[PDB]
From a paper:
[name] from [name] (Mtb) is a Mg2+-dependent [name], belonging to the chorismate-utilizing enzyme (CUE) family. [name] converts chorismate to salicylate via a two-step mechanism, with the release of pyruvate. As a fundamental player in iron acquisition, [name] promotes the survival and pathogenicity of Mtb in the infected host. [name] is known to exist in two possible conformations, generally referred to as “open” and “closed”, depending on the position of two flexible loops relative to the active site, as extensively analyzed in our previous work.
Moreover, we describe a new crystal structure of [name] in open conformation and in complex with the known inhibitor methyl-[name], suggesting that in vitro potency is not related to the observed enzyme conformation. Interestingly, in our [name]-methyl-[name] model, all protomers were rather found to be in an open state, with poor or no supporting electron density for most of the mobile loops (residues 273–284 and 327–331) in three out of the four protomers in the ASU. However, these regions could be traced entirely in the fourth protomer (chain B), mostly due to stabilizing packing interactions involving the Gly277-Ile280 β-turn. However, contrarily to the previous complex, and despite an equivalent pose in the active site, no hydrogen bond interaction could be observed in our complex between the methyl-[name] enolpyruvyl side chain and the hydroxyl group of Thr271, supporting the hypothesis of a correlation between this interaction and the closed state of the enzyme. These findings are in line with our conclusion that the overall [name] conformation, and most notably the closure of the active site lid, does not correlate with the inhibitor potency in vitro, with different protomers showing different conformations in the presence of the same compound. We also described a novel, higher-resolution complex of [name] with the known inhibitor methyl-[name], in which the enzyme, conversely, adopted an open conformation.
Author numbering: 16 to 273, 285 to 327, 331 to 450
């Protein structure tokens, strides 16, 4: 069913307000995913797939089926998610940074019960765009919430509450210096290290999402309440998109400014070129021979970046999870060469990273996959609320400038935190 979107109603506001009110009223988890002008609210859990380092669980109708798994995490997750998609048209969820370590032989360094992915089939889907609201399997209470919201309008967003991000309790400056020393010793070229920032008060996730969305222009965005986790984020990069017709895309970004300097700066050009070569090598491993190409190489995309589009056709011997695995973790938030960068993050960052630098995903029964890189995000789990931001460290990096860069990335969220109502 479809309802015309009334004039003067912003889709991000309506979708986040609908997520807040209806799911609390009917007692269900949800994931809201913004993708190319559609805010897709996946509400309620028909079935849940939980992939951990040491176990895979599928939970349906209150019953959990547990199993041991070995080999590639993408194969284990893909087999279970393909079964979900025999019964529903789409599945949604998140994939941890730790999902990408098996490829590099680092699986044995994960602690027991480390989460790798959470993917669910929803009971209801509501898609909100500037044009209309589309309803899929929406029952009486979900339809009544949409009607009430169109009559009452969205809530006014309250004033935000400040947070101090100047302290360094995790020793980010010291950790950057260790990475700089390893890079000078030739261990690797670049690594992204990060720091958590505790938010000392509880936040309202849907209101914070709406407020931050007015001041960010992301490639994708999300807001979720799933299995005891709340999270929201303004993803700056597409990890991968797989279409039903088999076309695979990845759009790495490297080099940033607040245009002539960025396009002529040797440091930005080298970092971009190296990322593009890495993505092309990874995509070529899952692609039909001769189908991989760089389209719009090193073009300029409040920040401006150098960007490239890598496109290929998925090989009939491969699949969307093998494509996600091949491109995971993203270079943008891991390092170069990837294997040494990922290994360095185990030693020099607070692990497990969990959602941070992993992905939020939307899968479709026709073979589609849309995976956004999780950065510029906030999380709440077990009574703890936190932000997390990092910076790419190269041989010339200085700990003080890198700490300042994390402050700049945190500023996408720190002025927009709405305290719990
Ligand atoms: C998408 C590319 C960029 O931004 C990020 C890279 C690494 C870490 C972060 C972060 O926010 O932690 C980030 O926003 C970049 O800074 O090149």
């Amino acid at each position: 069913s479809s309802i015309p979107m009334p004039a003067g109603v912003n889709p991000a506001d309506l979708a986040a307000e609908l997520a807040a009110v209806v799911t609390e009223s009917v007692d269900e988890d949800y994931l809201l995913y913004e993708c190319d002008g559609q805010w897709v609210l996946a509400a309620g859990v028909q079935a849940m797939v939980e992939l951990d380092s040491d176990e895979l669980r599928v939970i349906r109708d209150g019953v959990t089926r547990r199993q041991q798994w070995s080999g590639r995490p993408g194969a284990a997750l893909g087999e279970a998610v393909d079964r979900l998609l025999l019964e529903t048209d789409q599945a949604f969820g998140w994939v941890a940074f730790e999902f990408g370590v098996h490829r590099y032989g680092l699986q044995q360094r994960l602690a027991p019960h480390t989460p790798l992915a959470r993917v669910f089939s929803p009971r209801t889907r509501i898609m909100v765009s500037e044009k209309e609201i589309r309803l899929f399997d929406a029952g009486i209470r979900h339809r009544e919430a949409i009607d009430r919201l169109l009559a009452t309008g969205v809530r006014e967003v309250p004033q935000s509450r400040s947070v101090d991000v100047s302290d360094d309790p995790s020793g980010f400056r010291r950790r950057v210096a260790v990475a700089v020393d390893e890079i000078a010793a030739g261990r690797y070229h670049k690594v992204i290290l990060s720091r958590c920032v505790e938010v000392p008060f509880a936040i309202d996730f849907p209101l914070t999402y709406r407020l931050g969305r007015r001041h960010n222009t992301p490639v994708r965005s999300f807001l979720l309440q799933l299995g005891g986790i709340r999270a929201l984020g303004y993803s700056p990069e597409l990890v991968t998109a797989v279409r039903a017709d088999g076309v695979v895309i990845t759009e790495p970004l490297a080099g940033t400014r607040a245009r002539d300097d960025l396009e002529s700066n040797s440091k930005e050009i080298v970092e971009h070129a190296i990322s593009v070569r890495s993505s092309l090598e990874e995509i070529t491993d899952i692609a039909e021979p001769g189908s991989a190409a760089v389209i719009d190489f090193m073009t300029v995309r409040s920040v401006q970046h150098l960007g490239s589009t890598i496109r290929a056709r998925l090989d009939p011997s491969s699949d969307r999870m093998a494509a996600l695995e091949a491109l995971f973790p993203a270079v943008t938030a891991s390092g170069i060469p990837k294997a040494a960068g990922v290994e360095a993050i185990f030693r020099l960052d607070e692990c497990p990273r969990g959602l941070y630098s992993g992905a939020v995903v939307m899968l479709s029964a026709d073979g589609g996959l849309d995976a956004a890189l999780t950065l510029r995000a906030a999380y709440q789990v077990g009574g703890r609320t936190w932000l997390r931001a990092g910076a790419g460290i190269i041989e010339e990096s200085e700990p003080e400038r890198e700490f300042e860069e994390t402050c700049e990335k945190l500023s996408t969220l720190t002025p927009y935190l709405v305290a719990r109502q």
